[PDB]
Design a binder for this molecule. Structure first.
Ligand SMILES: C[N+](C)(CCOP(=O)(O)O)CC(=O)c1ccc(-c2ccc([C@]3(O)C[N+](C)(C)CCO3)cc2)cc1
Ligand SMILES: C[N+](C)(CCOP(=O)(O)O)CC(=O)c1ccc(-c2ccc([C@]3(O)C[N+](C)(C)CCO3)cc2)cc1
Ligand SMILES: Nc1ncnc2c1ncn2[C@@H]1O[C@H](COP(=O)(O)OP(=O)(O)O)[C@@H](O)[C@H]1O
Ligand SMILES: Nc1ncnc2c1ncn2[C@@H]1O[C@H](COP(=O)(O)OP(=O)(O)O)[C@@H](O)[C@H]1O
Ligand SMILES: [Mg+2]
Ligand SMILES: [Mg+2]
Lengths: 339, 339
């Protein structure tokens, strides 16, 4: 649309500067990749200084985001950029931001299991967990957010859908306490977590450090075990499935013990790189982490199942959110019973 | 106060973590340095990881700051920290932030003229001007802000003070156009400027890179000439004077031509360090910059004079804001006439 093109043009010229000052309106169009758009400097123009030739314009939702929330999100994004753990940040303004376009493609679900890529993901996740960030270090995110989601679900206006509420079908309010008790018995260090290391958020670089993570919507200080366990759960789900419900679950694609240990070995090699450990101490760290993840992986099911019920309340036919929620809760109980 | 101590305690434990988790309330008190407070970890405690032992708690005003303004301020502060151009950032929360306490003292007015310190200030200012920041690069800050201040002054409710309005005494609305025309004829590159490089914002490090700038309240993309000229104006004003109006002006302390060239040589040595320039090209850059600064220094007087009238509207006997404004406008006209 004429207005959207004009805004993108103005934002690029004003926030990027340099060669962008010489671009004429008729030479620039936005390409949707929807709230995300690619903007490219015309080929005939040389760059002036270090200003980027390739950016992504990210527009914020029509949805209300609090002031404090936007401060935290923007500060987080800016810091991860400086530390080379996310895309560079080139503009912040009320409507959105301009980010580095990373030449890349996202991973696919099946690629997560390839040993060399899985080792690289482990290494990157551990790098992320090494970050000191200016946010609360108290680990209230996991159960605080789940408690909030449950309250929000309880408060939803009735819609007319006749089915038993999933909170009741799966006794989720009671079950949350059972999970809390289990995880309270399971030590897991509190670290800066990504919280959504799915294939769609892992970019395979065309100009390799071979990967970059994106999508920090959910990132927070949280239990290490959640970030790893959540990643393992993602081996099961493909969100590119082309028929309703527009995801597919393959439960047998959950990582085997050997696949989990391979990831864990590479994770710990990075996490513990500055430490002098015997092979025996290393073995213990690996075994303990295997158990830790087996339990915190259950929180991935529980968290996303609750989140998905809320998504269903704002959706119709574009994705089977309620179906997905039920899949996560079924796997929760199955895996809980296999402990 | 009990409440303020408790809040500081909670913020330190929650945002700093590490050894701060082991601190007991009775071991921590805040020291005012008022919205700024020092918090120190007890001496008996060893640090756990990289968490700071010495922080400054900065509380935000009771005064309204917009959402977008707080995003920009916080992002700016976080980026300058990463680039080692400001204090590290350890917590952001609705009420304020936790920053690195920099072991240091501020410079004094008379120290600005010492050649070795002035060379270091020039070098640091040029470093700051090298920054690419995710903010508007269009140079509307100077006249946009002055136009806004003038409008705000025009809109002030009458107070009962009988004196001629300084806007009228000095014909400032007309004079702003005269200044704009002068500066429009004076090329000055647009760079990321500090905008308030006064002695009180230059910290002399106890653990030396010998200086750190602080106070980014006014920082923005702006004309280089303003940042340098503003700094030179600051050689004249001491804000520690102990009798009303609580500043002192020493007009003869404005830098001589030689003092200005000394600063300029060191500024350009840093700004142009990656460039192959002849001694002749270097001489021209120095001479041109001398003229540039002579003109943009006038904007320092004009800007702060307007700002000071606004400060007077919220002040009584703590500082002679209106007196200060008049001093800046008198010097503006004197120096304009000496061009
Ligand atoms: C577990 N998970 C990590 C939760 C957080 O998700 P995000 O990382 O925020 O996406 C992923 C997840 O639950 C998820 C991921 C993707 C989708 C999704 C995928 C595709 C669509 C779709 O509208 C489906 N379509 C058939 C209409 C084609 C265009 O894309 C809509 C939703 C829905 C749910
Ligand atoms: C030109 N300048 C760089 C403008 C921006 O100032 P800031 O860097 O934001 O301070 C500095 C400036 O105009 C200025 C600087 C300092 C002061 C100031 C200095 C001292 C006080 C005072 O309340 C005075 N006191 C006698 C009551 C003792 C305690 O401190 C109050 C105000 C007033 C004005
Ligand atoms: N900085 C970037 N560079 C290149 N591609 C990106 C970038 N950020 C996101 N993408 C692409 O856009 C997709 C969605 O972006 P993301 O930040 O994950 O937002 P969301 O998943 O909330 O829509 C990613 O899967 C990736 O393909
Ligand atoms: N990070 C810091 N470390 C040590 N001292 C600081 C720090 N920040 C500010 N100060 C001290 O506090 C004073 C005021 O802080 P500043 O950030 O300039 O705020 P303002 O001038 O708006 O009150 C400085 O002159 C300096 O003496
Ligand atoms: Mg994503
Ligand atoms: Mg200051």
């Amino acid at each position: 649309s004429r207005d959207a093109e004009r805004r993108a043009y103005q934002w690029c010229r004003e926030y990027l500067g340099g060669a962008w000052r010489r671009v004429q309106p008729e030479e620039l169009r936005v390409y949707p990749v929807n709230l995300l758009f690619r903007c490219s400097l015309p080929d005939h123009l040389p760059s002036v200084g270090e200003e980027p030739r390739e950016v992504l314009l990210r527009l914020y939702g029509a949805i209300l985001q609090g002031v404090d929330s936007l401060v935290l999100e923007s500060v987080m994004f800016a810091i991860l950029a400086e530390r080379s753990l996310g895309p560079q940040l080139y503009g912040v303004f009320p409507e959105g931001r301009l980010e580095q376009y990373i030449p890349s493609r996202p991973l696919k679900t099946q690629e997560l299991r390839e040993p060399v890529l899985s080792a690289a993901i482990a290494t990157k996740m551990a790098q992320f967990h090494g970050m000191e960030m200016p946010f609360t270090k108290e680990p209230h995110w996991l159960f605080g957010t789940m408690e909030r989601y449950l309250k929000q679900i309880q408060d939803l206006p009735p819609t007319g859908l006749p089915e038993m509420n999933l909170l009741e079908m799966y006794s989720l309010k009671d079950e949350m306490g059972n999970l809390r008790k289990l995880l309270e018995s399971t030590p897991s260090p509190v670290v800066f977590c990504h919280n959504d290391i799915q294939e769609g958020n892992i970019l395979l670089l065309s100009e390799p450090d071979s990967l970059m993570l994106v999508d920090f919507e959910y990132s927070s200080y949280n239990y290490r075990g959640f970030d790893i366990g959540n990643h393992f759960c993602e081996w099961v789900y493909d969100y590119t499935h082309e028929e309703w419900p527009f995801y597919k679950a393959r439960p047998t694609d959950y990582p085997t013990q050997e696949q989990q240990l391979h990831f864990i070995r590479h994770y710990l090699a990075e996490a513990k790189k500055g430490e002098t450990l015997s092979q025996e101490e290393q073995r213990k760290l690996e075994e303990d982490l295997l158990v830790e993840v087996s339990r915190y992986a259950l929180a991935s099911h529980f968290f996303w199942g609750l989140w998905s019920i809320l998504q269903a309340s704002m959706s119709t036919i574009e994705f089977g959110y309620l179906d997905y929620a039920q899949s996560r809760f079924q796997f929760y109980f199955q895996q809980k019973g296999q402990l």
